[PDB]
Design a protein around this ligand. Sequence first.
Ligand SMILES: *[C@@H]1O[C@H](CO)[C@@H](O)[C@H](O)[C@H]1NC(C)=O
Lengths: 218, 218
Amino acid sequence: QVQLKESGPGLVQPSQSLSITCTVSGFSLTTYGVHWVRQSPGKGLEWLGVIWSGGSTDYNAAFISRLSISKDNSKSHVFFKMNSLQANDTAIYYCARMRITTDWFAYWGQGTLVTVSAAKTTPPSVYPLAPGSAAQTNSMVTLGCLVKGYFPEPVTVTWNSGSLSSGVHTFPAVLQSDLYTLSSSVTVPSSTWPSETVTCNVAHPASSTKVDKKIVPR
Amino acid sequence: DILMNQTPLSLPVSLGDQASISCRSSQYIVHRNGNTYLEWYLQKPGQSPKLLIYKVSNRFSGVPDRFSGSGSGTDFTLKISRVEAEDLGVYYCFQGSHVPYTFGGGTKLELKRADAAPTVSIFPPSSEQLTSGGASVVCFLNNFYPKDINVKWKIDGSERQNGVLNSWTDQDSKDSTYSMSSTLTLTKDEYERHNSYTCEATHKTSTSPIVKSFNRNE
Ligand SMILES: *[C@@H]1O[C@H](CO)[C@@H](O)[C@H](O)[C@H]1NC(C)=O
């Protein structure tokens, strides 16, 4: 059916530019305008600009100096280019058909997550989290894994090679300095640990590292 | 720029309830070529926003009849006759009348449930980390509802602000609870200077904080 396909980078170096292509299908760029929007945690959804069916553009005034949008009608391509990116430009970017007059064709692209950083690829340190020596006993016990100092995202954390899946919580990564850190926890019946071994498996495809850490009593 | 102000910021609902969400603009949203460009979007976890209503009250195709929009001038309303599970997510109003076009800040529609106190767990630095010269204390606060929660760190009973990084999950799709991690990062030297480490959680389920603690000497 009707679709907008986005293509562009996951990572942009600070001061460098961000090029995204939106490929339209199901309708003609000669017929409708295409808008660009971004979404960040801090700022919410922000409209960036539009290229109208007729070929003219309008831009959000807070971006007009470093923003540009053009299109190729024949190949159904819309081109988005933003210059001089900085850390606060980290966001998901979307092309969208919006400001709708008719009952048809209104769809947004799968967004492009763009991370702005000068970090280099860095494998994680992986640390097991066993309960303290004197921690109080429950019918359940929580264990954990701390994954620290990696770049870029993502890592994938699994427990017992994915065999332990229920009672798992893996938290979003957060920027610590210019590297990422996350933790994951698993909860098992108290009777099963340490008698039944529990190991976190942490993969980081960008550094080709795969590390297992058994959680051992301290 | 035109401010779009949404109310409420979050709306707990159970399935089968009615729901009403409001959006107020800082200016009259005037027609353009006889069209009033006021739209409502729903964004589910991990997906792009999808158009629900365009031109104030027109249901986009595929959008079920339980959705309706109304309003004029500065005041607009999205109504849901009868909430289904697939209606959970973040709703945004959008105005396409005055450049720069602008979105509301979002209203999260979320599923109401029985109250749950968080399961709190605290973990001393791993000895692997200690050898590297770092010391992260980790606290997991898992499977709580409602979402409001505050975490306080204490070192020898003295409130600790610096070096704390928190990470929250979104509402779990299965049990509808929330989870949070809190990590206090210190140098190894700093860690050694102190004996007692406490994570204190304040949650609606009680006035008395949930305290978990360990002592560096055991
Ligand atoms: C974000 O950072 C840049 C570069 O430091 C600054 O000039 C820009 O205005 C900031 N933008 C916002 C919206 O805070």
